[PDB]
Amino acid sequence: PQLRVHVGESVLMGCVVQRTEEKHVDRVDWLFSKDKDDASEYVLFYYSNLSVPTGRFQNRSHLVGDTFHNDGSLLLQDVQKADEGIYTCEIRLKNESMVMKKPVELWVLPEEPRDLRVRVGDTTQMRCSIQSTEEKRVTKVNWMFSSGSHTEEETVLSYDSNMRSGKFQSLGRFRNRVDLTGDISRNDGSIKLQTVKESDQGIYTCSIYVGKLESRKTIVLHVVQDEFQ
Amino acid sequence: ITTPEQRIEKAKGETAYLPCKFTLSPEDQGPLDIEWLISPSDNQIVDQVIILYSGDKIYDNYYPDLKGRVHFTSNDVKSGDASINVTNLQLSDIGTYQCKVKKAPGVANKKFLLTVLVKPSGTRCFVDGNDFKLKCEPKEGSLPLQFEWQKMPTPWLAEMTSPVISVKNYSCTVQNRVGSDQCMLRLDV
Numbered sequence: 313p314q315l316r317v318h319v320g321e322s323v324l325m326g327c328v329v330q331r332t333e334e335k336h337v338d339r340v341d342w343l344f345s346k347d348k349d350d351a352s353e354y355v356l357f358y359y360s361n362l363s364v365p366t367g368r369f370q371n372r373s374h375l376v377g378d379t380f381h382n383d384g385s386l387l388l389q390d391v392q393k394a395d396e397g398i399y400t401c402e403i404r405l406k407n408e409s410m411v412m413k414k415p416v417e418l419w420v421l422p423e424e425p426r427d428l429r430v431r432v433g434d435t436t437q438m439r440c441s442i443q444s445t446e447e448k449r450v451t452k453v454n455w456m457f458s459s460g461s462h463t464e465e466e467t468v469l470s471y472d473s474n475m476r477s478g479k480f481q482s483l484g485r486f487r488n489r490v491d492l493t494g495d496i497s498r499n500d501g502s503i504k505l506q507t508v509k510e511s512d513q514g515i516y517t518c519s520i521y522v523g524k525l526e527s528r529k530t531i532v533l534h535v536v537q538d539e540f541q
Numbered sequence: 542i543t544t545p546e547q548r549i550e551k552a553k554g555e556t557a558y559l560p561c562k563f564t565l566s567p568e569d570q571g572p573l574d575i576e577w578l579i580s581p582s583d584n585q586i587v588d589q590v591i592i593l594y595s596g597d598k599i600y601d602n603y604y605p606d607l608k609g610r611v612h613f614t615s616n617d618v619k620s621g622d623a624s625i626n627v628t629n630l631q632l633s634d635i636g637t638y639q640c641k642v643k644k645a646p647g648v649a650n651k652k653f654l655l656t657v658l659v660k661p662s663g664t665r666c667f668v669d670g671n672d673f674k675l676k677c678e679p680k681e682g683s684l685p686l687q688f689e690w691q692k693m694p695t696p697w698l699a700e701m702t703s704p705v706i707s708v709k710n711y712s713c714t715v716q717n718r719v720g721s722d723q724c725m726l727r728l729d730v
């Protein structure tokens with residue numbers, strides 16, 4: 313299993329021991345090892361209701377798996393180039409003496425540029441996702457806008473699985489010209505802005521959640537109209 | 542730079558000593574917890590718990606194959622000693638043995654590669670101007686095996702060492718680097 317993430321973004325490495333029933337996870341070890349290197353380091357380990365993110369992942373790794381439905385999935389945030397390698401979930405279920413070994417390979421791509429240049433009239437995609445090996449993991453996506461220094465904000469678009477008719481399109485400066493290019497069921501929250509105007513020039517800020525955990529992305533959209541001389 | 546998985550070579554029917562001594566650090570305040578895992582034939586998809594230490598109570602409760610055959614050497618395991626003994630070693634006990642110590646936030650790990658050789662014993666000596674074959678077939682054993690047949694047969698002298706005397710027209714000593722064996726046969730023309 314492969315995953316590709318850009319530096320800065322987040323990734324959810326699934327770990328779901330699929331039995332024929334609900335079983336409480338007794339333990340998970342997440343180890344990290346660089347390709348072709350036998351050295352390895354603990355990322356996060358969990359036992360008897362105790363979660364211990366460790367090492368240089370101490371601030372970045374969370375256990376987002378449901379400990380009741382056989383799930384020890386990991387969420388890694390603010391990914392760096394030094395995170396490139398194999399990650400191995402070692403997991404054991406309660407009232408059960410079998411330990412499961414599931415690996416996942418992580419490739420890290422260079423950072424996405426913060427600056428985006430588009431011409432008036434253009435449709436422009438704005439990328440935002442959590443790469444994952446498991447579906448339906450994103451809970452909430454929130455796009456805000458603003459030429460934002462000492463200035464207020466607007467809601468571009470928002471979605472919230474938790475809620476019913478979760479889709480919300482600005483209806484402000486983004487009247488019926490903004491929508492999801494992908495689907496959240498695949499943990500993607502990318503949107504497109506259809507008719508770029510000068511008035512749209514500012515900071516768009518994506519905010520993607522798996523529960524309470526936030527991953528923020530910010531894109532600076534420049535807009536140009538060629539004066540004809 | 543890292544350190545490999547200690548390699549332990551033992552004979553059958555006896556007891557393997559796997560050292561796993563630890564020193565706690567002041568941070569390390571969580572519940573102490575030890576868990577030994579066996580990895581049969583080293584398959585990298587699954588390990589099994591053999592012995593576990595938790596709630597300051599031991600558990601030998603699993604891996605029915607090892608029922609009654611594995612124990613923490615130490616008396617006071619918390620004192621910083623997690624070593625174990627594996628008793629009455631058999632060929633099924635071959636695998637990879639791992640020592641996992643956890644006391645939040647501290648954690649340690651040791652890999653042990655266990656190998657179980659068998660002293661050669663249980664060799665059959667049997668015969669099949671004919672096209673004879675004399676045979677010294679062992680089981681169980683392990684290679685590289687050596688054979689030496691005796692009594693002073695001249696056209697057999699070359700076969701003295703091979704386990705088959707393909708005869709055409711008193712002993713058999715069997716040896717490896719962990720044990721020996723003696724067997725006797727009779728022939729008639």
Ligand SMILES: *[C@@H]1O[C@H](CO[C@@H]2O[C@@H](C)[C@@H](O)[C@@H](O)[C@@H]2O)[C@@H](O[C@@H]2O[C@H](CO)[C@@H](O[C@@H]3O[C@H](CO)[C@@H](O)[C@H](O[C@H]4O[C@H](CO)[C@@H](O)[C@H](O)[C@@H]4O)[C@@H]3O)[C@H](O)[C@H]2NC(C)=O)[C@H](O)[C@H]1NC(C)=O
Nearest residue numbers: 354355364365366367368369370371372373389390392526
């Ligand atoms: C993990 O992150 C922690 C900080 O995270 C904190 O705790 C978490 C539980 C969570 O609540 C977080 O949201 C919360 O931030 C790191 O620990 C901090 O490390 C920094 C860096 O050294 C410390 O910063 C120092 O703070 C001093 C006062 O408290 C201050 O005097 C220092 O200023 C000096 O250093 C800076 C550059 O670092 C320099 O610019 C200044 O001019 C000056 O020289 C310094 O900033 C924090 O105090 C630590 N923890 C706190 C405040 O709780 C930890 O390093 C990190 N670990 C990993 C592996 O990422």
Ligand SMILES: *[C@@H]1O[C@H](CO)[C@@H](O[C@@H]2O[C@H](CO)[C@@H](O)[C@H](O)[C@H]2NC(C)=O)[C@H](O)[C@H]1NC(C)=O
Nearest residue numbers: 555556557558559612613614615616625626627
């Ligand atoms: C665990 O096994 C080890 C390994 O055999 C035992 O160590 C032996 O102890 C005896 C008695 O003192 C010594 O004479 C031997 O030299 C030791 N090792 C051998 C023969 O291999 C140890 O005694 C056992 N401990 C427990 C608690 O079971």
Ligand SMILES: *[C@@H]1O[C@H](CO)[C@@H](O)[C@H](O)[C@H]1NC(C)=O
Nearest residue numbers: 405406407408409410602603
């Ligand atoms: C489950 O744990 C209980 C604790 O009392 C134990 O009695 C039981 O044997 C365990 N069963 C299995 C199948 O692991």
